[PDB]
């Protein structure tokens, strides 16, 4: 019956079944999903199976200065049109099938390590093209609710940085994973730390700190050492601009504790100029590749002390057994100093 | 053709601008834009007499791009 | 590329305030914004 026919929108809303108890709680999963297709896309007004040529609708109205008359394509001429539409339909299906693959993160199914692009431009014509965003954690949080039972939300941790010392991180929360990405990355750009870098490649000194139960021990390293650190630290260090560092994470390996523990330690590092100003002495760098040449890296801006720094015969500094065990050749690990890809 | 009171001259510059847009956005744009010499000379002169000197100075480049002879009156103004 | 067609200005802008309106709406016709 002609009167029982419906519109395309009605037919797709029913067939897709996007509203319903199946889609409310994700009670139904979709390895095979009906996909909406626009069936009016490649259709031309006036074109039908019979192949009639209507002047002014599907063919030009005037030809050679005279009005065209009703005509019909030959059976052969119409087969070509039909075949051409099928090929054009498969070409469109293949153009959509040809989608550029995006690089993976720490693993194929992991979100961690994936770039989200620069933060969105602020309302007042503000732009952050110089900043890159990296995901550090994507979690599904399940909230028990008074009336709706277990609901599913997304908590995202992302870090931003420009590669020149300015970096920050923020948590994002939303029901949708892509809204959480927007919240986290946009908020992080307003909570940027500045991290001082020695020679724009490493930290100024060894940093060992604890944040809650996460211990992070970082070592200053020379050029060419690379980033031999927890994969999350590697991600953050590329955003800050540190190229050479060793780091070891102990205790709880909690991503959030690690991120803010890492940023707390890197933001409280004393530069060489601050050391010279604090002690009013020269800072002299001795490099074995340069032999005994003394390289003054920092000199005090104020007066220069005349009294040498007291030489305590034995320092009362606390040592790490892991560092000492390594220097004494008593550290045996099959996993240490393994060959890995450039980081 | 001739100079006019400031009120009229301003109105002629609003039309010359709209004509300029027509020359710039022709549907023969696929073919090289044909900017007659008289049209370029008149449109520039109308901008000067209206006080839109900034627009007139910019147009001088189009005399070299299209290789159109500038009119004596335009150079003196 | 052919320019997209531009809708003309509503012909109300050409109507004089002392016109003969019955000539605009001589017979029953639907409301036309461009004509009223």
């Amino acid at each position: 019956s002609f009167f029982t026919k419906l519109t395309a929108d009605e037919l797709w809303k029913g067939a897709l079944a996007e509203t319903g108890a199946g889609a409310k709680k994700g009670r139904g999963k979709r390895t095979k999903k009906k996909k909406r297709k626009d069936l009016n896309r490649g259709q031309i007004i006036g074109e039908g199976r019979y192949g009639f040529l209507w002047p002014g609708l599907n063919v030009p109205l005037m030809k050679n200065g005279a009005v065209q008359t009703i005509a019909q394509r030959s059976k052969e001429e119409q087969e070509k049109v039909e075949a051409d539409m099928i090929q054009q339909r498969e070409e469109w299906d293949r153009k959509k099938k040809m989608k550029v693959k995006r690089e993976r993160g720490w693993s194929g199914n992991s979100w961690g390590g994936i770039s989200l692009g620069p933060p969105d431009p602020g309302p007042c014509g503000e732009t952050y093209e110089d900043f890159d965003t990296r995901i550090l954690e994507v979690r599904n949080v399940f909230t028990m609710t008074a009336k709706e039972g277990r609901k599913k939300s997304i908590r995202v941790l992302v870090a931003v940085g420009n590669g020149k010392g300015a970096a920050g991180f923020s948590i994002g929360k939303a029901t949708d994973r892509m809204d959480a990405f927007r919240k986290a990355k946009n908020r992080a750009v307003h909570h940027l730390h500045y991290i001082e870098r020695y020679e724009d490649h490493t930290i100024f000194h060894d940093i060992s700190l604890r944040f809650k139960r996460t211990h992070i021990k970082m070592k200053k390293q020379p050029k060419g050492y690379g980033l031999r650190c927890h994969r999350a630290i590697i991600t953050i260090c590329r955003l800050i601009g540190i190229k050479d560092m060793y780091a070891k994470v102990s205790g709880s390996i909690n991503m959030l504790s690690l991120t803010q523990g890492l940023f707390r330690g890197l933001s409280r590092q004393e530069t060489h100029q601050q050391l010279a100003d604090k002690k009013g002495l020269h800072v002299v760098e001795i490099r074995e590749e340069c032999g005994p040449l003394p390289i003054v890296v920092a000199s005090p801006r104020g007066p220069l002390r005349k009294d040498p720094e007291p030489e305590d015969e034995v320092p009362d500094v606390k040592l790490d057994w892991e560092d000492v065990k390594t220097a004494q050749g008593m550290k045996r690990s099959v996993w240490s100093n393994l060959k890995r890809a450039a980081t | 053709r001739d100079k006019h009171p400031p009120e009229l001259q301003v109105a002629f510059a609003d039309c010359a601008a709209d004509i300029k847009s027509a020359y710039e956005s022709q549907p023969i744009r696929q073919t090289a834009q044909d900017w007659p010499a008289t049209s370029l000379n008149c449109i520039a002169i109308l901008f000067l007499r209206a006080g839109r000197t900034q627009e007139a100075w910019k147009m001088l480049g189009l005399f070299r791009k299209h290789n159109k002879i500038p009119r004596s009156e335009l150079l003196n103004e | 590329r052919p320019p997209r067609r531009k809708a003309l200005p509503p012909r109300t802008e050409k109507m004089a305030v002392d016109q003969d309106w019955p000539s605009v709406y001589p017979v029953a016709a639907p409301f036309k914004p461009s004509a009223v």
Binding site: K99, R102, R104, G108 | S25 | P3, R5, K6
Partner: peptide
Amino acid sequence: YLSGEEVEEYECYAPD
């Protein structure tokens, strides 16, 4: 996402 996400002027009176 890693497969890819590819959902993918002038006006004239009496045009031609």
